[PDB]
Amino acid sequence: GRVIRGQRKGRGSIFKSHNHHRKGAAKLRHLDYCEKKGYIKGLVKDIIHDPGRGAPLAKVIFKRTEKYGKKEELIIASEGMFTGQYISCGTKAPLSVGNILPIGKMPEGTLICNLEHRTGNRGTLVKASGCYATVVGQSEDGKKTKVRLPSGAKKTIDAKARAMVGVVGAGGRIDKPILKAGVAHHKYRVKRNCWPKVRGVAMNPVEHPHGGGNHQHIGHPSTVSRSAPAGQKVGLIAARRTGLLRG
RNA sequence: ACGGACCAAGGAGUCUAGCAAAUGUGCAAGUGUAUAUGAUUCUUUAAACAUUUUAUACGCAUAAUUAAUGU
RNA sequence: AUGCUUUAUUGAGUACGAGCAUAUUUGGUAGGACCCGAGAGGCUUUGAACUAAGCGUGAUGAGAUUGAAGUCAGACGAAAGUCUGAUGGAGGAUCGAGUUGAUACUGACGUGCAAAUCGUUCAUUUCAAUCACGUUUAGGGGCGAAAGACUAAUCGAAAAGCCUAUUAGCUGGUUAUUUUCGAAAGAUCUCUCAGGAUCGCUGGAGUUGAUUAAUAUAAUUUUACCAGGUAGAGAUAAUGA
RNA sequence: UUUGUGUUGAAGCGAAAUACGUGAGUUUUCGUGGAACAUCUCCCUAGUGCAGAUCUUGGUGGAAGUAGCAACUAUUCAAAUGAGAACUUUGAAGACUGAAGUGGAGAAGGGUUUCUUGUCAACUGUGAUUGAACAAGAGUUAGCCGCUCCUAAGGGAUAGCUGAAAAGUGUUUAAAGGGGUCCCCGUCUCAAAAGGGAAACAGGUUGAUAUUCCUGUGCCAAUAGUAUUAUGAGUUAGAUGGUAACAUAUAUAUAAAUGAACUCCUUUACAUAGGCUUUACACUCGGGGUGCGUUUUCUUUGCACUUUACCU
RNA sequence: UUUGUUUUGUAGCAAUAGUAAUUCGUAAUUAUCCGAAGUGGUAAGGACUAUCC
RNA sequence: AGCGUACCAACAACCGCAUCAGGUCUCCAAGGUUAACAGCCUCUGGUUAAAUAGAAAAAAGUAGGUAAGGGAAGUCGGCAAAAUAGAUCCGUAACUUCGGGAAAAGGAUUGGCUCUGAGGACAUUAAUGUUAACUCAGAACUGAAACGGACAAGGGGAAUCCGACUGUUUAAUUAAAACAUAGCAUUGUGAAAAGCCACAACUGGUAUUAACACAAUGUGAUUUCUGCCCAGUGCUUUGAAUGUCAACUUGAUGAAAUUCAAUCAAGCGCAGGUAAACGGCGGGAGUAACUAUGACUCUCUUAAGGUAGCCAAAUGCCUCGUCAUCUAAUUAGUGACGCGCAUGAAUGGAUUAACGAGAUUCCCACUGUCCCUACUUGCUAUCUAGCGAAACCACAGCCAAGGGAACGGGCUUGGCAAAAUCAGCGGGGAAAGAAGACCCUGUUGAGCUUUACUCUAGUCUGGCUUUGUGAAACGACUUAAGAGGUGCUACUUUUAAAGUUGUUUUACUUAUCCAUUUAUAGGGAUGAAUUUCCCAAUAUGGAGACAUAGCCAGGUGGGGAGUUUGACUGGGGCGGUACAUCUGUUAAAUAUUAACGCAGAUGUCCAAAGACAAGCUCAAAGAGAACAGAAAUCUCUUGUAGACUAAAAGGGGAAAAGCUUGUUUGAUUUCUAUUUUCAGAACAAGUAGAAAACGUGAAAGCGUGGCCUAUCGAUCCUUUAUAUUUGCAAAAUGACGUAAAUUACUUACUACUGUGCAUAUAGAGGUGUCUGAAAAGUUACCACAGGGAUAACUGGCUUGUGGCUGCCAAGCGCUCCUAGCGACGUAGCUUUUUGAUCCUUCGAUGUCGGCUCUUCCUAUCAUUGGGACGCAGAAGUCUCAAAGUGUCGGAUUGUUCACCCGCUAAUAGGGAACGUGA
RNA sequence: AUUGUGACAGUAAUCCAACUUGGUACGAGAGGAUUAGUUGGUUCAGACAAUUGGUACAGCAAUUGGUUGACAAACCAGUGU
Ligand SMILES: [Mg+2]
Ligand SMILES: [Mg+2]
Ligand SMILES: [Mg+2]
Ligand SMILES: [Mg+2]
Ligand SMILES: [Mg+2]
Ligand SMILES: [Mg+2]
Ligand SMILES: [Mg+2]
Ligand SMILES: [Mg+2]
Ligand SMILES: [Mg+2]
Ligand SMILES: [Mg+2]
Ligand SMILES: [Mg+2]
Ligand SMILES: [Mg+2]
Ligand SMILES: [Mg+2]
Ligand SMILES: [Mg+2]
Ligand SMILES: [Mg+2]
Ligand SMILES: [Mg+2]
Ligand SMILES: [Mg+2]
Ligand SMILES: [Mg+2]
Ligand SMILES: [Mg+2]
Ligand SMILES: [Mg+2]
Ligand SMILES: [Mg+2]
Ligand SMILES: [Mg+2]
Ligand SMILES: [Mg+2]
Ligand SMILES: [Mg+2]
Ligand SMILES: [Mg+2]
Ligand SMILES: [Mg+2]
Ligand SMILES: [Mg+2]
Ligand SMILES: [Mg+2]
Ligand SMILES: [Mg+2]
Ligand SMILES: [Mg+2]
Ligand SMILES: [Mg+2]
Ligand SMILES: [Mg+2]
Ligand SMILES: [Mg+2]
Ligand SMILES: [Mg+2]
Ligand SMILES: [Mg+2]
Ligand SMILES: [Mg+2]
Ligand SMILES: [Mg+2]
Ligand SMILES: [Mg+2]
Ligand SMILES: [Mg+2]
Ligand SMILES: [Mg+2]
Ligand SMILES: [Mg+2]
Ligand SMILES: [Mg+2]
Ligand SMILES: [Mg+2]
Ligand SMILES: [Mg+2]
Ligand SMILES: [Mg+2]
Ligand SMILES: [Mg+2]
Ligand SMILES: [Mg+2]
Ligand SMILES: [Mg+2]
Ligand SMILES: [Mg+2]
Ligand SMILES: [Mg+2]
Ligand SMILES: [Mg+2]
Ligand SMILES: [Mg+2]
Ligand SMILES: [Mg+2]
Ligand SMILES: [Mg+2]
Ligand SMILES: [Mg+2]
Ligand SMILES: [Mg+2]
Ligand SMILES: [Mg+2]
Ligand SMILES: [Mg+2]
Ligand SMILES: [Mg+2]
Ligand SMILES: [Mg+2]
Ligand SMILES: [Mg+2]
Ligand SMILES: [Mg+2]
Ligand SMILES: [Mg+2]
Ligand SMILES: [Mg+2]
Ligand SMILES: [Mg+2]
Ligand SMILES: [Mg+2]
Ligand SMILES: [Mg+2]
Ligand SMILES: [Mg+2]
Ligand SMILES: [Mg+2]
Ligand SMILES: [Mg+2]
Ligand SMILES: [Mg+2]
Ligand SMILES: [Mg+2]
Ligand SMILES: [Mg+2]
Ligand SMILES: [Mg+2]
Ligand SMILES: [Mg+2]
Ligand SMILES: [Mg+2]
Ligand SMILES: [Mg+2]
Ligand SMILES: [Mg+2]
Ligand SMILES: [Mg+2]
Ligand SMILES: [Mg+2]
Ligand SMILES: [Mg+2]
Ligand SMILES: [Mg+2]
Ligand SMILES: [Mg+2]
Ligand SMILES: [Mg+2]
Ligand SMILES: [Mg+2]
Ligand SMILES: [Mg+2]
Ligand SMILES: [Mg+2]
Ligand SMILES: [Mg+2]
Ligand SMILES: [Mg+2]
Ligand SMILES: [Mg+2]
Ligand SMILES: [Mg+2]
Ligand SMILES: [Mg+2]
Ligand SMILES: [Mg+2]
Ligand SMILES: [Mg+2]
Ligand SMILES: [Mg+2]
Ligand SMILES: [Mg+2]
Ligand SMILES: [Mg+2]
Ligand SMILES: [Mg+2]
């Protein structure tokens, strides 16, 4: 047989990310003395667009505290921020949209985004456009905070980790029909080489488990086990259930 | 039924190991001078000549049979 | 126990030794093995000047048609709203040169101009558009809007050199004269039925005999003796009609 | 081993014989040839005897003076040269290409095919005096056109870590290297003759080069120390005008309006579609001047020329 | 510092160059190089409007 | 400063083997007509050359043009060609996703010349002057009624099938209904200990990412829908109640090696979920006031019994289904019907405007497709001067028949047969090209698949090491309180003490691992910014002896590797076993003898159905005896086997080989000579005997399985029996046994000597392909060596079947065998049907039908001349000589065949390699 | 060089209609021949061009675009139409 299409992606030759015009990685600010004792405030200079990403980025300027000079950050922007705005980051910053606070000082019900799942991590969890989380519970002895992730899962975090108040901007962009093949050609042109897609039952047996036959059918159960080797896991992977959902 | 338009040159049961039968030769209860060494051997000679100054190198034969101690 | 005894059975055993060395020929075995002949397998290297996909930097598409939202004006109407004229320039919109392709004649040619060309006809031109140079991906691997397609006239596994004079129960060939003898195409076993081993049929060596109109001998008769259930017959004898 | 032939002609080859043998073959004559050749007296030895294998290499036939020498509209008259002109040169005709040209200028690829002179053994599928064939000599000139410098998609390396090595990765805890006077910054190197980017124009000139040569007029970059003269400005440690938007150094030449560490910004620097508008090049009309053409008839007529670069 | 001009200059380069003509012996002269408008083919600049999961 | 600078850029300087009609990237761009850088003509610049020229000019070709009357009658099919086209002014249906359809369909006009009208700017005063530039309307005249005059330039309409649309594809035979697509649905994953994927290892891709994300599948716009089944196969969830399931570990025994036990791994099992997972979704019988039908009922039965829909559909064999319509005539088209061989719901069902170099039917226009051909132009062909190849070639080229390897140029017998040469042509040379690609064979391959055989990367699970420091709690070996029984003894029975060892559960930080940074302040209270108080004196943060890593062990594992997938055979395959055996016959009177010949049997059975002895006589019939009868049990007569003897068939058997009794284990251990098959090998199955111990009978005797002919198995390995026989490579193991003697290394004698293993001899565990390999499929993507030893055509022998012709006379014909016929039976002929066979061809004889063209036959349809009738005439029927002359136009189908509409004089049947593809 | 003989080989014509005979023969009626004659036609064969039609790069005329200054005369657009 021949190596399957999904196996070739791990070599990373024509399947690497398309990133010529991207603007940089979005991080929080590095944890230091100011955000551990008081707070520090930086000024929003511009909201810009990142070619591969749905959400927009804010360009925000802080003033160096250990030397004379200015410093730059790129941060996922929450819906409501404007150019000319001052935001404040630290353990003692007030509760307002756009500030960055430790999650252990937020009351129950607050909507947060751009969260650290470990302290000092510089933000990993809630980042896609239109997404938010919810603070659901606080530990009685401190030290622990409970949140509800966009997928619906519940997760307990260290209570010193940081997050931004508000929701990710540019929300609602999965409600417009794409409606044309060329529109999707332009969409993935700036992401990676994953489109269009030929389906397995239309191939020959050498190159897919679904190939061959005189009638274009699968011929074997399409739910495969978690333990199958690389060239064989191709249908529905370790599915607990199939068919239309009814609840 | 297949190969062959014509002419000249080339073109296919051999070599080595190991066994047997047949036949020629030498000696004969024996037979074969191994590897070496010797010599008034040294164009030929890489051939030929020699054998350690009641005489235990080795092979095959002179005795068979049995899993075997053995006989 | 220095085991004994006629027993019976077995040995490639014994009963006053024949062997060893050496030419040559022939037979069967291994080797390139009488000569020339695969489809394949393995080890190590070369190629993206063609073509496939991604990426960087640049360049290119005569002319014409249609007329979306927005805007100005006029007419109705109690409100809500509705009618007519112009302006405007949207769309994987329409026709069509060039460019990019290849529907039909199942046309020409088919010892071609050409190892895919020529003529007319046809599809396509603001977009999933076309071209150049640079750059990434290398063989059981790559690339594929998917035809087992393409990867230098080579792809249901590229090209180059070695292992290698690989192996073939199968096709083809196998070179001076005269003289003498002269077949088999049955049989047994066989992953055996286009093969092989074994018997039979043939040749060549050698000894023992006969050479005494004898004896041994004979695909022949005669004399003596033996065994048989086919042709014929029977159905009033058995069985079955 | 024996015993023989040859310049008074060996081997080989061609045609033969009142010749021998059942036969394969021996033997001899004449011609050509010009230097070696046998042994049958008996033995030894081998890469030792061809009609074929779509056998191997080389040479030669019938087919046969045959198939054929058909795209791209098309040729004619006279003269020169020459041994010899349908396809070399000159003049006169009739025509084609028709700016999306067999017109001009470059890239990839080629490497002297370029030029002048000579010249025809072979080639230029008919001819050939022609030619990109053959021979002998020549010809390519830059501060301003390019490369060279920058960085891109990317390639190769360093430290470390893997692996027997060959090789694979490329900061993954390097006392990394460099630069601003001791302190700061901080891996190296290559990859674009269409992307970024100091600076030039016109006329003339050769058989063959030209924004490169000649003539004239300009521009850009660089230029160390010491003095001396000259130009100009400023305080007698740094000038003025305007209410403002902002402006001012015109000396051969608008050259000078202080400003260290440290810090911020701008230019380089950027997609597509649609119409409106401006300037330059292009084309056209009517006057003036100059040359040419038609002219039985008509035509104050038909055609050509009437130009002006960078730089200040 | 105000006017039609006393007046020149193709603003300098620049006519000394180029082009089209007419003469003079086997290289020199001389004359011209100037008045008003249309069409929109190509190129570049300007101020704008629109499109993008 | 250094390096480049000539020339070509295709037209002969480049690549294509060449001076090849091919391929190959950028910039400049005039006049006329026009919307136009289109087409046609022209000025500047370039050229007048092409591997040749002259003459002639017929067949045939190739590229073109025209054609009276008809108008698709041609053909599989309107293939090719024709018709239409620019602008302006009118007029436009069904249907529809309201955007379209649309250039729908249709109608009228257009030259030239002479005129009229309408559209701007500027500067002096509603007046006056100076000046453009191209468009658009109207009118009169005019001409062989012509005018987008050349160039350029849509045919349209009514319907059916498929795909929604723009897009993509097999470079060089397939451009599509195939792929893609938006829309819809399902699955996995909260992260540097995560999902999917790469790598030998170290390390990487997605990732400059974070559920509105990345990854893996299916279906394929909109509209309206998406039924029932979790039994099977997959996937997935719970676990010490729970069976099975490794290493390690612990215990018991033993001199030890061993041996025997026990225990919370994952898997499977047990118990659930899931169909927009793979997939599935029934028969029989009766019944309503005429028939017919079956709302209704009864019955078998599944995990569930095909629901909404839809149909002789690109899906229906029968089939050219039945009805209607379209035509003159319809295997075609459309609309209906439905027990549908074998329709059906994201394997998507049913529809659908717009779109398409997609598949089909009809209508108008148009025409040389056709009736039915003719004429004409260029370039070839032709003759000449120059120049000048190749394929192919056993030898060569007239026929008829014969025989022959069954189709001859050569052989036999005949016909005949007279130099040399030019141009055409396609009957033959079973013509050329290529070691047949279909079929079979080979102990020759390869690609692909899987619940074929054997393995393997990856992945999941357990142990040991890496691996340090404290604590607690439950066990278990080591002690003390008992119901009982047992023959002192020998064993379970109640609650803390013993030292150690173990599960498990926590705490610590320094091993180990991860993250962030410029390793930049010890814990609490849309200007510029640089020369306080209290509390204590490993860069930081997060995990932590768990991960990770190394060795070993178990599960899963077509993702991957290697290999296999019998023989016979009226071709192979499917069937069967004729593959190891046995009875009768074919078998031709010794013996042997074939076929997928004929009628059958075998892989067993028996403590007696084996051995011996004695007594007895069987099947059946007749007569007779209470219930008793056709048959119960009793006597008597007759009785050559007509019974019985395990199982096929054949042979044998009467004081027995059969039945009934009595006693028994000869169905026992060892050895020879030999018969059957046959090589005169094995196995196996038999015959005659010898040595030993026994049974039976009074005894002579008989007995080594079954009255005779079938009833079965090598090497290697394993397993139990036998022995006064052996071994384990320098030696010993009963035993210092028995006698002496010591002052010890003393002397002599003996059949009998550790665990475990090996070995000799005998039986058993099995190979049925039976003289004995551990073995699944597919190839329509295909390879190689061969085969006319072997299939798919023509030809050859045969003639069952197919077709045609005879003989006899029951009966038909009102009557009457034979005008015309002829049942029950019988003899032939032909090779225009289909079979049977396998002789020729597999280093190749082109495989259906039509079109075209010639010739042959007669078994005569018409035309010529006759005979007979159940013959008035007319019209016909049977038959003789006879092959001279004819034997058509169309609708449907690829058709041969068939069927219908027509005309005719009649619309006969056949052959020539199933005549005829250079 | 003219005119001839002619062995042998090839060979060619075919079928139909109407009318008269005749509403006759025959027949109860209904119906209704043969044969011969006349005038035409189908298929085939061998020629031919007075008439009709087809054909055009003899010829004459008309005309679109372009080009010679105009008229006249012409030419190009592979045969412009
Ligand atoms: Mg496919
Ligand atoms: Mg597979
Ligand atoms: Mg499908
Ligand atoms: Mg052969
Ligand atoms: Mg041949
Ligand atoms: Mg030779
Ligand atoms: Mg000898
Ligand atoms: Mg060989
Ligand atoms: Mg192999
Ligand atoms: Mg390339
Ligand atoms: Mg590319
Ligand atoms: Mg379009
Ligand atoms: Mg073509
Ligand atoms: Mg063709
Ligand atoms: Mg396929
Ligand atoms: Mg070989
Ligand atoms: Mg003889
Ligand atoms: Mg053979
Ligand atoms: Mg007998
Ligand atoms: Mg008889
Ligand atoms: Mg000699
Ligand atoms: Mg000499
Ligand atoms: Mg030889
Ligand atoms: Mg030869
Ligand atoms: Mg010729
Ligand atoms: Mg020439
Ligand atoms: Mg032309
Ligand atoms: Mg021209
Ligand atoms: Mg043009
Ligand atoms: Mg030259
Ligand atoms: Mg020259
Ligand atoms: Mg020549
Ligand atoms: Mg030269
Ligand atoms: Mg420069
Ligand atoms: Mg880079
Ligand atoms: Mg560089
Ligand atoms: Mg540049
Ligand atoms: Mg030059
Ligand atoms: Mg130069
Ligand atoms: Mg040059
Ligand atoms: Mg080459
Ligand atoms: Mg060329
Ligand atoms: Mg040429
Ligand atoms: Mg012609
Ligand atoms: Mg005409
Ligand atoms: Mg006509
Ligand atoms: Mg028809
Ligand atoms: Mg027809
Ligand atoms: Mg057509
Ligand atoms: Mg329509
Ligand atoms: Mg489509
Ligand atoms: Mg399309
Ligand atoms: Mg193709
Ligand atoms: Mg095609
Ligand atoms: Mg599809
Ligand atoms: Mg999809
Ligand atoms: Mg659909
Ligand atoms: Mg289930
Ligand atoms: Mg378990
Ligand atoms: Mg199925
Ligand atoms: Mg139904
Ligand atoms: Mg239908
Ligand atoms: Mg029809
Ligand atoms: Mg079904
Ligand atoms: Mg369903
Ligand atoms: Mg289905
Ligand atoms: Mg010619
Ligand atoms: Mg030749
Ligand atoms: Mg013949
Ligand atoms: Mg022949
Ligand atoms: Mg003859
Ligand atoms: Mg022929
Ligand atoms: Mg073959
Ligand atoms: Mg072959
Ligand atoms: Mg294989
Ligand atoms: Mg496999
Ligand atoms: Mg077979
Ligand atoms: Mg006999
Ligand atoms: Mg008897
Ligand atoms: Mg008895
Ligand atoms: Mg018995
Ligand atoms: Mg066998
Ligand atoms: Mg056998
Ligand atoms: Mg296979
Ligand atoms: Mg045969
Ligand atoms: Mg017959
Ligand atoms: Mg042949
Ligand atoms: Mg052939
Ligand atoms: Mg043939
Ligand atoms: Mg008749
Ligand atoms: Mg008849
Ligand atoms: Mg035929
Ligand atoms: Mg026949
Ligand atoms: Mg053909
Ligand atoms: Mg045919
Ligand atoms: Mg033929
Ligand atoms: Mg006429
Ligand atoms: Mg005429």
Short mmCIF file of N, CA and C (backbone and C1' of nucleotides) and ligand atoms in Angstrom, two decimals, chain F residues 78 330 332 361-362 891-893, ligand 63:
data_model
loop_
_atom_site.label_atom_id
_atom_site.label_comp_id
_atom_site.label_asym_id
_atom_site.label_seq_id
_atom_site.Cartn_x
_atom_site.Cartn_y
_atom_site.Cartn_z
P G F 78 -32.01 10.75 -38.27
"O5'" G F 78 -30.87 11.68 -38.88
"C5'" G F 78 -30.46 12.88 -38.23
"C4'" G F 78 -29.24 13.48 -38.90
"C3'" G F 78 -28.71 14.75 -38.24
"O3'" G F 78 -27.30 14.84 -38.42
"C1'" G F 78 -29.57 15.26 -40.41
P U F 330 -48.21 0.86 -36.67
"O5'" U F 330 -46.72 1.26 -36.28
"C5'" U F 330 -45.62 0.45 -36.65
"C4'" U F 330 -44.47 0.62 -35.69
"C3'" U F 330 -44.83 0.40 -34.22
"O3'" U F 330 -43.83 -0.36 -33.56
"C1'" U F 330 -43.92 2.58 -34.53
P A F 332 -40.15 -0.36 -28.06
"O5'" A F 332 -39.42 0.77 -28.90
"C5'" A F 332 -38.02 0.99 -28.77
"C4'" A F 332 -37.60 2.33 -29.34
"C3'" A F 332 -38.09 3.56 -28.60
"O3'" A F 332 -37.35 3.85 -27.42
"C1'" A F 332 -38.44 3.86 -30.90
P U F 361 -33.53 9.36 -30.79
"O5'" U F 361 -35.01 9.94 -30.66
"C5'" U F 361 -36.12 9.07 -30.54
"C4'" U F 361 -37.42 9.83 -30.36
"C3'" U F 361 -37.82 10.80 -31.46
"O3'" U F 361 -38.36 10.17 -32.61
"C1'" U F 361 -38.19 11.78 -29.34
P C F 362 -38.24 10.86 -34.05
"O5'" C F 362 -39.30 12.05 -34.03
"C5'" C F 362 -40.69 11.81 -34.10
"C4'" C F 362 -41.50 13.02 -33.68
"C3'" C F 362 -41.53 14.20 -34.64
"O3'" C F 362 -42.42 14.02 -35.73
"C1'" C F 362 -41.17 14.98 -32.44
P A F 891 -38.18 4.51 -43.72
"O5'" A F 891 -39.40 4.24 -42.74
"C5'" A F 891 -40.27 5.27 -42.31
"C4'" A F 891 -41.14 4.82 -41.17
"C3'" A F 891 -40.42 4.18 -39.99
"O3'" A F 891 -39.89 5.15 -39.10
"C1'" A F 891 -42.27 2.85 -40.59
P U F 892 -38.46 4.95 -38.41
"O5'" U F 892 -38.65 3.71 -37.42
"C5'" U F 892 -39.30 3.87 -36.17
"C4'" U F 892 -39.40 2.57 -35.41
"C3'" U F 892 -38.11 1.84 -35.11
"O3'" U F 892 -37.41 2.40 -34.01
"C1'" U F 892 -39.78 0.30 -35.80
P U F 893 -35.83 2.63 -34.05
"O5'" U F 893 -35.19 1.20 -33.78
"C5'" U F 893 -35.43 0.49 -32.58
"C4'" U F 893 -34.98 -0.94 -32.69
"C3'" U F 893 -33.55 -1.14 -33.18
"O3'" U F 893 -32.60 -1.01 -32.14
"C1'" U F 893 -35.02 -2.59 -34.35
MG MG H 63 -38.51 8.16 -36.24
#
